[PDB]
Design a protein around this ligand. Structure first.
Ligand SMILES: CCCCCCCCCCCCCCCCCC(=O)OC[C@H](COP(=O)(O)OCCN)OC(=O)CCCCCCCCCCCCCCCCC
Ligand SMILES: CCCCCCCCCCCCCCCCCC(=O)OC[C@H](COP(=O)(O)OCCN)OC(=O)CCCCCCCCCCCCCCCCC
Ligand SMILES: CCCCCCCCCCCCCCCCCC(=O)OC[C@H](COP(=O)(O)OCCN)OC(=O)CCCCCCCCCCCCCCCCC
Ligand SMILES: CCCCCCCCCCCCCCCCCCCC
Ligand code: SF4
Lengths: 198, 102, 162, 100, 60, 314
């Protein structure tokens, strides 16, 4: 099951262009450069993930280009203020295809605790979001888990190989949600450690 | 000699393959993938100092490959050359021509 | 040997012709750099290895860099130059081109009447050039240093900002 | 085996092309560029003449020629920057204050 | 600038190079998620659940 | 078509092609190794999951940068914008083209040598200049003026730093340079030439600490060209430094390629250590150190080298 952007369609995938699509998706997902965009405390945990104690460099996501042209992924990590929302939209428009968006934190997800006059209630109001991370702030390993989720999201999506041959629309897989996938093991939890110890 | 024409062919192949490889990777990058203040005069001064000292450097380049054949007389001549060059450099430094921040 | 000389000479002639008839300063300087590379190739085909080395080191590596520096410093967007097209009107360029062509035929007629056994193309190394430079040409080197110093002093005195 | 006359013809062609660019161009920058072409063509002629006779005199005179060319380019660009700073244009026909 | 200042600066640059090399010769401080599971304290504030009594009915 | 001359010509062509392929893959794998070595210096691991030990990360980067959307700005000059990465790659590549890696293993045995290296660096400054102009951005224009001023201020003494080895060898040929190091490597007599050439080679490669932006408008394959040209240039400067100051391929026990590759890789590791350790100096002190200190040092070193050579020539 896939979704078009130029519509809910099926999988269109001879065998040579199939292997080409898997190789292109593998190269895209194994080399994702985030854009260095500092908004709020969620970016502090993002750069905490960037340091040596968590090693986001292992996933090939450590180049951290200061220009949106050289970046493939926008990590909106912070509150979406009304003054900063045109800046976010302009920086998103400056990025080039393929582009993916990770919302980091409850502010970027939905506005979070700041349902206030000067905060846009979520970055999905004006730019599309690929991965959402709950948390305030999400811990750095949660950001790396969201990076892995984006990696398997990219790994089966279909994009044109060239701009002159083939269908130019972009396919995005309707993935099974992590909630229903993890419900089998989350409900079975019965006992946890008592909060009186270290 | 066979060695010299072979070396010329190898150098020509190196130049051609390098230029064509960068051109081919530019073509491949263009082919693949779908679609959707007044400058001060200190830059001129620095570049002009580079030009003048580069010509004096070319004179020193010519001298350095024939130091043994020129003897001590060539050493004396290059000593006056380098002393004049260093006097010019000291003159440039002491008048603030090479200082960026005033 | 002669193939490289003829091809590089034709490339330099075409590049200089595109230099003198261009409006963009950066494109003109790029074609000038291409002509300098071609003339250095002509130098290397004739055995004057030091001449080509100093052509790309200094002429195409210092002087043209200075010209591009000045052009990008001025931010020349072709104000009253790109919108004029004055040199492309035949009433402006027919005269000087005819005069330069006449002088070219005169110089060519003078050139064609000289003894010419050809150029053997034996490579004159930089070692012999440096031997002659600091041998029979000592005062040339010292007074050329003096001339470079004078040009440096004048350009500093003129091109200050204050 | 390359004739000396062909190299001298190439040098003459470049010299008259640089002079034509010096004459027909009203910009001071293109005038300096044409001057650079002329002095480079003269240096090319000296190199061809020196290599015909098998002497280092042509390369030594080329070294002096490019020293002069670098210094003259520096001088002309300093004067061009002064002109553009104090008049805001590079029109060489407009700078005609004294005549007759 | 002073020559003593230049010598002191060269010495402190050499010291910086040497101590960065010594840091390179030290032990890694990286917790390798997800191969190494993240240790969370028992009162860590993560995913919210609803629980049951010892009798098995929902506590809410 | 069976003739020893054609066989030798084809063998030399294949040798040059092999040298070029090893150089470009070494530059790309050195970008990956720069990432890994920065991880090693900063008490971390770096990329080690894409393939065995992260060795397939470069292939992923190349596939992404090839299949990214190629972009040229709407209000920009197309020829200059396309031509800047061409220069940034090919200039310092053909600067490598003169380096002898082994006896009988050279691309061009030119009579000019490091003179040709100087031609290639003087051509290489045009990459920064053209990238600054063609971006149609005044911020990138000012950044390119600053970067080009730095590269000119250190190329003003790059060749004079190499002139000590030129004087002691007595010729411009690289084979004669590595033959003159049969007893004492040039790092011992030409130590001031060695440090000045190190500083100049660091500065002309736009590396730490002599850098800065004019890279912001490029993306996709052009940015990758600038990146791989930078790392290929670091390889070029390291190999030239090995062949000029550390004897090149000469060694007591190991085969000559083993010694040359070991010295080159040590200098690449020293490059990464320099990037990891030293901070960023300001512009005024950088240009003052480039002009007031290093250039008179090279002049005095050349004078002392000439005096020592003529004193030792009875
Ligand atoms: C092919 C059709 C056109 C295609 C497009 C243009 C491509 C570039 C054309 C110009 C450059 C290459 C010319 C051909 C050179 C081939 C090699 C050659 O002829 O070598 C002869 C000689 C070798 O040395 P020597 O010892 O004299 O050998 C005598 C043999 N016993 O060689 C020498 O002595 C010196 C050789 C020349 C100097 C080195 C190379 C200079 C290159 C300058 C390039 C300038 C920019 C060109 C830009 C073109 C596009 C705008
Ligand atoms: C984007 C592309 C732009 C244009 C790029 C260049 C176009 C031409 C490409 C094809 C060239 C074909 C090969 C040309 C001949 C090569 C061999 C050669 O030059 O041999 C002559 C000479 C031999 O020296 P040696 O062996 O010591 O002689 C003793 C006895 N003969 O050796 C010499 O004289 C060596 C010195 C000359 C070497 C010239 C190398 C190229 C110079 C131009 C680089 C351009 C860089 C990119 C553009 C920069 C910005 C404009
Ligand atoms: C293959 C080629 C590459 C080879 C790789 C290995 C060698 C790498 C060489 C890297 C060289 C880096 C040079 C950095 C120069 C910086 C100069 C500068 O701007 O210094 C400014 C700083 C302060 O100066 P000041 O004006 O007094 O400011 C005070 C104002 N309140 O001034 C100071 O703090 C004073 C000291 C200035 C710097 C002196 C030189 C230090 C060089 C770095 C350390 C190298 C140690 C040896 C490394 C191994 C070599 C084998
Ligand atoms: C950083 C190193 C770059 C090297 C570029 C050139 C590669 C050329 C490969 C040559 C291989 C054969 C060397 C001669 C044979 C003797 C040594 C054999 C074991 C390596
Ligand atoms: S979600 Fe919480 S931690 Fe993140 S930006 Fe908002 S307030 Fe800060």
């Amino acid at each position: 099951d896939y979704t078009l952007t130029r519509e809910i369609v099926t999988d269109p995938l001879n065998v040579f262009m199939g292997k080409l699509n898997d190789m292109v998706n593998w190269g895209r997902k194994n080399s994702i450069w985030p854009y260095n965009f500092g908004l709020s405390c969620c970016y502090v945990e993002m750069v905490t993930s960037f340091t040596a104690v968590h090693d986001v460099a292992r996933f090939g996501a450590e180049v951290l280009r200061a220009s949106p042209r050289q970046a493939d992924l926008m990590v909106v990590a912070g509150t979406c203020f009304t003054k900063m929302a045109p800046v976010i939209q302009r920086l998103y428009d400056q990025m080039l295809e393929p582009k993916w968006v990770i919302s980091m934190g409850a502010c970027a997800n939905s506005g979070g605790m700041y349902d206030i006059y000067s905060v846009v209630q979520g970055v999905d109001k004006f730019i599309p979001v690929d991965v959402y991370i709950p948390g305030c702030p999400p811990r750095p390993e949660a950001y790396m888990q969201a990076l892995m989720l984006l990696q398997e999201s990219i790994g089966k999506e279909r994009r044109p190989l060239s701009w002159v041959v083939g269908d130019q629309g972009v396919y995005r897989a309707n993935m099974q949600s992590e909630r229903e996938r993890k419900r089998g093991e989350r409900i079975a939890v019965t006992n946890l450690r008592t909060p009186d110890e270290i | 000699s066979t060695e010299v024409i072979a070396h010329h062919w190898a150098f020509a192949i190196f130049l051609i393959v390098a230029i064509g490889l960068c051109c081919l990777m530019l073509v491949g990058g263009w082919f693949l993938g779908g679609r959707a203040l007044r400058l001060s005069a200190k830059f001129y001064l620095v570049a002009m100092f580079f030009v003048i000292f580069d010509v004096e450097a070319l004179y020193l380049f010519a001298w350095s490959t024939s130091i043994r054949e020129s003897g001590w007389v060539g050493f004396v001549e290059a000593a006056i050359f380098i002393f004049v060059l260093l006097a010019g450099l000291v003159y440039l430094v002491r008048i603030g021509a090479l200082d960026w921040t005033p | 040997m002669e193939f490289a000389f003829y091809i590089c000479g034709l490339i330099a002639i075409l590049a200089t012709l595109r230099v003198i008839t261009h409006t963009n300063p950066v494109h003109a300087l790029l074609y000038l750099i291409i002509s300098l590379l071609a003339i250095s190739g002509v130098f290397f085909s004739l055995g004057a290895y030091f001449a080509g080395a100093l052509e790309i080191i200094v002429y195409a590596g210092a002087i043209m860099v200075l010209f591009v520096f000045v052009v990008m410093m001025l931010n020349l967007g072709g104000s009253e130059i790109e919108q004029e097209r004055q040199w492309l009107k035949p009433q402006v360029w027919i005269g000087p081109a005819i005069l330069s062509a006449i002088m070219l035929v005169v110089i060519v007629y003078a050139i064609l009447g000289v003894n010419d056994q050809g150029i053997d193309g034996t490579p004159i190394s930089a070692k012999a050039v440096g031997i002659t430079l600091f041998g029979p040409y000592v005062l040339a080197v010292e007074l050329a240093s003096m001339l470079l110093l004078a040009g440096l002093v004048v350009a500093f005195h003129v091109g200050r900002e204050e | 085996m390359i004739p000396l006359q062909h190299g001298l013809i190439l040098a003459a062609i470049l010299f008259v092309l640089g002079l034509t660019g010096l004459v027909i161009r009203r910009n001071l920058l293109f005038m300096l560029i044409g001057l650079e072409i002329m002095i480079n063509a003269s240096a090319l002629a000296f190199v061809v003449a020196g290599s015909y006779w098998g002497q280092t005199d042509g390369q030594v005179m080329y070294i002096l020629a490019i020293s002069l060319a670098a210094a003259e380019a520096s001088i002309g660009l300093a004067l061009l920057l002064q002109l553009h700073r104090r008049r805001q244009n590079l029109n060489i026909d407009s700078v005609s204050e004294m005549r007759g | 600038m002073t020559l003593k200042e230049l010598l002191v600066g060269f010495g402190t640059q050499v010291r910086s190079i040497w101590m960065i090399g010594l840091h390179a010769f030290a032990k890694r401080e990286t917790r390798m998620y997800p191969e190494e599971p993240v240790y969370l304290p028992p009162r860590y504030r993560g995913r919210i659940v609803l629980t049951r009594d010892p009798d098995g009915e929902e506590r809410c | 078509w069976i003739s020893p001359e054609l066989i030798e010509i084809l063998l030399t062509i294949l040798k040059a092609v092999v040298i070029l392929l090893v150089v470009v893959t070494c530059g790309a794998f050195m970008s990956f190794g720069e990432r890994r070595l920065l991880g090693l210096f900063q008490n971390r691991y770096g990329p080690n999951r894409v393939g065995w030990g992260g060795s397939l990360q470069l292939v992923a980067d190349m596939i992404k940068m090839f299949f990214k959307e190629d972009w040229i700005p709407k209000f920009s000059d197309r020829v200059i914008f396309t031509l800047a990465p061409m220069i940034a790659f090919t200039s310092l590549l053909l600067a490598f083209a003169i380096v002898p890696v082994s006896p009988g293993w050279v691309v061009a045995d030119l009579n000019i040598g490091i003179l040709f290296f100087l031609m290639m660096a003087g051509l290489a400054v045009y990459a920064v200049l053209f990238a600054g102009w063609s971006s149609n951005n005044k911020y990138s224009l000012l950044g390119a003026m600053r970067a080009s001023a730095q590269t000119l201020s250190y190329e003003v003494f790059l060749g004079l730093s190499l002139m000590g080895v030129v004087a002691q060898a007595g010729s411009f040929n690289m084979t004669d340079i590595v033959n003159s190091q049969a007893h004492v490597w040039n790092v011992i007599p030409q130590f001031f030439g060695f440090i000045t050439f190190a500083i100049a080679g660091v500065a002309v490669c736009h590396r730490h600490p002599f850098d800065q932006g004019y890279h912001i408008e490029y993306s996709g394959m052009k940015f990758g060209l600038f990146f791989v040209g930078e790392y290929i240039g670091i390889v070029t400067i390291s190999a030239l430094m090995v062949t000029l100051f550390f004897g090149g391929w000469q060694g007591p026990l190991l085969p000559p390629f083993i010694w040359f590759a070991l010295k080159t890789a040590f200098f690449m590791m020293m490059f990464i250590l320099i990037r990891a350790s030293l901070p960023r100096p300001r512009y005024d002190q950088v240009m003052s150190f480039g002009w007031k200190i290093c250039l008179p040092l090279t002049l005095i070193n050349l004078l002392v080298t000439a005096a020592v050579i003529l004193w030792q020539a009875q």
